[PDB]
Design a protein around this motif. Sequence first.
Motif, PDB file in Angstrom:
ATOM      1  N   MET A   1     -34.628 -34.474 -46.473  1.00 33.49           N
ATOM      2  CA  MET A   1     -34.373 -34.749 -47.884  1.00 33.49           C
ATOM      3  C   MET A   1     -33.213 -35.715 -48.024  1.00 33.49           C
ATOM      4  O   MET A   1     -32.177 -35.546 -47.384  1.00 33.49           O
ATOM      5  CB  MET A   1     -34.074 -33.462 -48.654  1.00 33.49           C
ATOM      6  N   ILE A   2     -33.385 -36.722 -48.868  1.00 29.55           N
ATOM      7  CA  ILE A   2     -32.425 -37.811 -48.996  1.00 29.55           C
ATOM      8  C   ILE A   2     -31.476 -37.503 -50.148  1.00 29.55           C
ATOM      9  O   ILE A   2     -31.897 -37.002 -51.203  1.00 29.55           O
ATOM     10  CB  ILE A   2     -33.144 -39.165 -49.192  1.00 29.55           C
TER      11      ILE A   2
ATOM     12  N   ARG B   1     -27.840 -39.150 -52.291  1.00 27.65           N
ATOM     13  CA  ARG B   1     -27.250 -40.431 -52.657  1.00 27.65           C
ATOM     14  C   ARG B   1     -25.876 -40.209 -53.267  1.00 27.65           C
ATOM     15  O   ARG B   1     -25.723 -39.405 -54.193  1.00 27.65           O
ATOM     16  CB  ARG B   1     -28.154 -41.188 -53.628  1.00 27.65           C
TER      17      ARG B   1
ATOM     18  N   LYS C   1     -21.674 -43.794 -57.326  1.00 26.34           N
ATOM     19  CA  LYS C   1     -20.793 -44.882 -57.703  1.00 26.34           C
ATOM     20  C   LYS C   1     -19.933 -44.445 -58.884  1.00 26.34           C
ATOM     21  O   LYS C   1     -20.365 -43.650 -59.724  1.00 26.34           O
ATOM     22  CB  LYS C   1     -21.610 -46.116 -58.075  1.00 26.34           C
TER      23      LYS C   1
ATOM     24  N   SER D   1     -22.832 -42.800 -61.316  1.00 21.01           N
ATOM     25  CA  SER D   1     -24.212 -43.250 -61.300  1.00 21.01           C
ATOM     26  C   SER D   1     -24.681 -43.352 -59.858  1.00 21.01           C
ATOM     27  O   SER D   1     -23.881 -43.332 -58.923  1.00 21.01           O
ATOM     28  CB  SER D   1     -24.352 -44.596 -62.004  1.00 21.01           C
TER      29      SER D   1
ATOM     30  N   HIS E   1     -27.707 -38.409 -56.239  1.00 18.41           N
ATOM     31  CA  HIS E   1     -28.801 -37.462 -56.147  1.00 18.41           C
ATOM     32  C   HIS E   1     -28.464 -36.467 -55.039  1.00 18.41           C
ATOM     33  O   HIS E   1     -28.177 -36.889 -53.911  1.00 18.41           O
ATOM     34  CB  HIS E   1     -30.113 -38.187 -55.853  1.00 18.41           C
ATOM     35  N   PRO E   2     -28.512 -35.151 -55.298  1.00 12.57           N
ATOM     36  CA  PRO E   2     -28.996 -34.518 -56.534  1.00 12.57           C
ATOM     37  C   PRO E   2     -27.980 -34.496 -57.665  1.00 12.57           C
ATOM     38  O   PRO E   2     -26.912 -35.083 -57.545  1.00 12.57           O
ATOM     39  CB  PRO E   2     -29.341 -33.087 -56.088  1.00 12.57           C
ATOM     40  N   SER E   3     -28.319 -33.808 -58.757  1.00 13.96           N
ATOM     41  CA  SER E   3     -27.615 -34.010 -60.021  1.00 13.96           C
ATOM     42  C   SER E   3     -26.321 -33.202 -60.153  1.00 13.96           C
ATOM     43  O   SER E   3     -25.515 -33.508 -61.038  1.00 13.96           O
ATOM     44  CB  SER E   3     -28.546 -33.666 -61.186  1.00 13.96           C
ATOM     45  N   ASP E   4     -26.111 -32.166 -59.335  1.00 18.37           N
ATOM     46  CA  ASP E   4     -24.866 -31.409 -59.414  1.00 18.37           C
ATOM     47  C   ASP E   4     -23.708 -32.323 -59.062  1.00 18.37           C
ATOM     48  O   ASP E   4     -23.729 -33.008 -58.038  1.00 18.37           O
ATOM     49  CB  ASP E   4     -24.898 -30.193 -58.478  1.00 18.37           C
TER      50      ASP E   4
ATOM     51  N   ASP F   1     -34.841 -45.713 -60.347  1.00 19.29           N
ATOM     52  CA  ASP F   1     -34.924 -45.291 -58.956  1.00 19.29           C
ATOM     53  C   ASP F   1     -34.701 -43.788 -58.774  1.00 19.29           C
ATOM     54  O   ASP F   1     -34.474 -43.339 -57.644  1.00 19.29           O
ATOM     55  CB  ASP F   1     -33.925 -46.089 -58.103  1.00 19.29           C
ATOM     56  N   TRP F   2     -34.740 -43.019 -59.861  1.00 21.76           N
ATOM     57  CA  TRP F   2     -34.594 -41.572 -59.924  1.00 21.76           C
ATOM     58  C   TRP F   2     -33.167 -41.087 -59.747  1.00 21.76           C
ATOM     59  O   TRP F   2     -32.953 -39.880 -59.848  1.00 21.76           O
ATOM     60  CB  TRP F   2     -35.468 -40.839 -58.896  1.00 21.76           C
ATOM     61  N   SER F   3     -32.195 -41.955 -59.472  1.00 20.79           N
ATOM     62  CA  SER F   3     -30.829 -41.478 -59.316  1.00 20.79           C
ATOM     63  C   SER F   3     -30.224 -41.189 -60.682  1.00 20.79           C
ATOM     64  O   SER F   3     -30.548 -41.841 -61.671  1.00 20.79           O
ATOM     65  CB  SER F   3     -29.967 -42.496 -58.566  1.00 20.79           C
ATOM     66  N   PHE F   4     -29.335 -40.200 -60.726  1.00 15.83           N
ATOM     67  CA  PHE F   4     -28.753 -39.729 -61.979  1.00 15.83           C
ATOM     68  C   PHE F   4     -27.526 -40.549 -62.386  1.00 15.83           C
ATOM     69  O   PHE F   4     -26.896 -41.233 -61.571  1.00 15.83           O
ATOM     70  CB  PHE F   4     -28.372 -38.258 -61.856  1.00 15.83           C
ATOM     71  N   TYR F   5     -27.193 -40.474 -63.674  1.00 18.69           N
ATOM     72  CA  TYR F   5     -25.937 -41.015 -64.174  1.00 18.69           C
ATOM     73  C   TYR F   5     -25.442 -40.154 -65.326  1.00 18.69           C
ATOM     74  O   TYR F   5     -26.235 -39.583 -66.086  1.00 18.69           O
ATOM     75  CB  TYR F   5     -26.064 -42.474 -64.647  1.00 18.69           C
TER      76      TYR F   5
END
Lengths: 276, 9, 99
Positions: free
Chosen positions: C1-2, C4, C7, C29, C32-35, C60-64
């Motif tokens: 599982m990846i 990220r 930033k 921003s 991933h994951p969102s916590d 790209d599904w990454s959270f901000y």
Amino acid sequence: GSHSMRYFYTAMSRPGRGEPRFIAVGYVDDTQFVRFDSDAASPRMAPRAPWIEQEGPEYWDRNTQISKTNTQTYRESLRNLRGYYNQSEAGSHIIQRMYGCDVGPDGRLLRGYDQSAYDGKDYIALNEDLSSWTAADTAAQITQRKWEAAREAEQLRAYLEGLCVEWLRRYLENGKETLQRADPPKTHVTHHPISDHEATLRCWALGFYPAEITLTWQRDGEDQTQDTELVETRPAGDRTFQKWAAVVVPSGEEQRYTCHVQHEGLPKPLTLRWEP
Amino acid sequence: TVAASGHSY
Amino acid sequence: MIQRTPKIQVYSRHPAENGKSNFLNCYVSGFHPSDIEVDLLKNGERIEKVEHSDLSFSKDWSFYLLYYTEFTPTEKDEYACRVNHVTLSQPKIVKWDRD
């Protein structure tokens, strides 16, 4: 000119810390206008922009009811996906979903979207024809067969060509003083010496909406793409956005460098130099 | 406005 | 599982003017994951009543998220943003660099 509506769903398991959380947010272009959070004291679709507040009780009841049902279905789907991948009950996992429509300036549908990711990786997406699916792996193929039998694609196509476009038209009219007002960037150029022979030129754009903008440096009319540091566009907190582009120039060569700014709120595209 | 609730994955 | 890592940008809503009210922003921003844990720091100390935008994500599904609070800058007070995430070995602190 053109516009979009998107809903963004995130469903997150947290084993040992209650049931999975479901969050929904709705946007028109770069403006958030609704949210739902299943951890809230009273879970419901709630307004996040002024122009949506006027919607009637049947609106908020429908949107809250769908969201409450989604909370349970996404909990079911996290359990299903955990099985599709032989994953244990200990880890936390995330389903994300985005769907919505793009309309051109006439309000006609340009295209619709629906796509899903599991733990950040593409899982299943509705094809552009709004009729077929792209599954990313043999787990997603199970979801695809479930959705074919449920006629998911036909329901989404009806939504994307019907309600999505109609309500987007209606949202754009009710919020026309903000959603259809392009605020131009405030711009200026700064100069930060690095050494005796080089300095940083930074081109600034502030207070613009929507977030879409083009910021570029040129040397002698030639683009400095490789050599420009671009920060990610960031929100100011007041609906507007900010961005900067920076380039390192030999000291004394400053006036061979121009910053170019295109934004929808600008009468004319801009060309700026460092003004000492 | 949200789309109708879809089927489970 | 990846996974990220976030930033982080620390900046103010308006250009900084000592004595005048403003907003301090910490924008995280690409994670991933969102916590995520985000605190705003005044001279070194957590600030209360910090708010934050609702959770969304990028193409790209990454959270901000945007964390913000009202404040009034002086030449004395130094501000920073402290971020912790599963990708980070220790909390990461980014100082507000005014200019």
